[PDB]
Amino acid sequence: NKTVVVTTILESPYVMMKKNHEMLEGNERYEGYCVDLAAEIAKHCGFKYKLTIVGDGKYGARDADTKIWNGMVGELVYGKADIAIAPLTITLVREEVIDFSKPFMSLGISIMIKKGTPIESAEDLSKQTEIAYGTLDSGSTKEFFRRSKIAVFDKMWTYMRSAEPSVFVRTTAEGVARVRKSKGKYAYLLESTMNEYIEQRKPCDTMKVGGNLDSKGYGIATPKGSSLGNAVNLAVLKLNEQGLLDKLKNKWWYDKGEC
Amino acid sequence: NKTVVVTTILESPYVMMKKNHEMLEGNERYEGYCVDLAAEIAKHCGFKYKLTIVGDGKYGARDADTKIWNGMVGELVYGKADIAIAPLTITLVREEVIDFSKPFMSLGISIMIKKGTPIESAEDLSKQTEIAYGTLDSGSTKEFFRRSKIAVFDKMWTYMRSAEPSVFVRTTAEGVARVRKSKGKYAYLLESTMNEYIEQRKPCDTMKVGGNLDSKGYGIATPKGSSLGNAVNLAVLKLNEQGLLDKLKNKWWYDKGEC
């Protein structure tokens, strides 16, 4: 009968600081796709909640040496949060330590280029060197390449892990900025959802090119064995069938379009 | 320990009888995406299985009066099958009575028209009468239109439910044949997966038009509480991350392509 601690991450357009946040308190300080989703899930599940941005600003990965989980996954694993409502990718290694609802959004790894870049696919990136390319420093995308057995992807990984300086970035915003200021000499591998979002934001100079490299989804996560998981899983399905999710995506992705 | 009874359905290209099937026995009589998926899953979960075609040839719905489930879901809820490996859509009503693995395939409801039919969208079908349209007699698609609040879809449901003669079909093949021999006076609403497949088969006279009406996925189902569920779910995720599911999709949809 207590307030649910929701761990989430500052990633546009999922969770963003409201323009006048410093004059607001609690949940009213945030806005975005996941903020709207959180209010809906909590309303349909009947619980009070509190949104908290993940301290280290990470999604979640296990450190090879210490074996400790960081990011939003870590907050769930070590009991700091009761639930995670964010663009957290459903992956095998995560599913082994936390529970995931059925996906509320479908997506895939994609390529983000500065308009004009002579690249139309991952294959293209692999068969050249002039243009550098990387992914987020930790998360499902980097893990995807590091584990792939498909020649093209494995080849891109061989290059990325040894590239110097590092082609990996700490945050999505860091990757987008790097694409924008690299005169077309840097491409960024990120999930199609974020790629499509950025493509509709000023200065409208980036572009999603080629098809997705894979298919997967984002799910609402809870600690392994949490009682909350069952209800939340059922709420996601109901909200999807009633069109809420489609409406929310259009709202934050296209209605707000700047291009 | 014991051979796992797999319930499935004859739906191309998921499960199909091989050409020389009469000379074969057991699982060897079948071929297809789901047949391969089944083998893979059984290999990684370590068990023997028997493929059985669902008796009433239905996906699964609950009779409003008797409250009895039919089709594959019915076989699972009543203990006739241990698992269902087929293109069974993850939904709220089904999730309430059976367990679903994370989706092994993403899809949406789509429109199939005979080439040349003057229809580009759902809205187009709703604003006219000359062209009849309907869905599978029972399944997630028919349910979607019945539980739809969206004006366009709702309007389509009113027409379909009252239409005469009936526009609903017992099987997808029947829906497809109806479109093909109706001079374009009938459009069939079915899942994008089947639509895309048919679009690539002779006589090559059908088309998937417009975008998907919704987003959802297929999941491997198991009786609620089943022990096999956990391992199967982790296996689906493993196969997706290794690229196998993408491989099978290309193999059965486009490598086989005839148009």
Ligand SMILES: N[C@@H](Cc1nsnc1O)C(=O)O
């Ligand atoms: N959604 C990913 C992080 C991410 N966002 S864009 N590229 C990425 O890797 C994760 O949940 O780890």
Ligand SMILES: N[C@@H](Cc1nsnc1O)C(=O)O
């Ligand atoms: N996959 C659906 C049936 C179906 N296949 S193509 N159009 C449809 O409605 C179900 O699982 O009920």
Ligand SMILES: [Cl-]
């Ligand atoms: Cl046997």
Ligand code: NA
């Ligand atoms: Na109505």
Ligand SMILES: [Zn+2]
């Ligand atoms: Zn395998």
Ligand SMILES: [Zn+2]
């Ligand atoms: Zn009845």
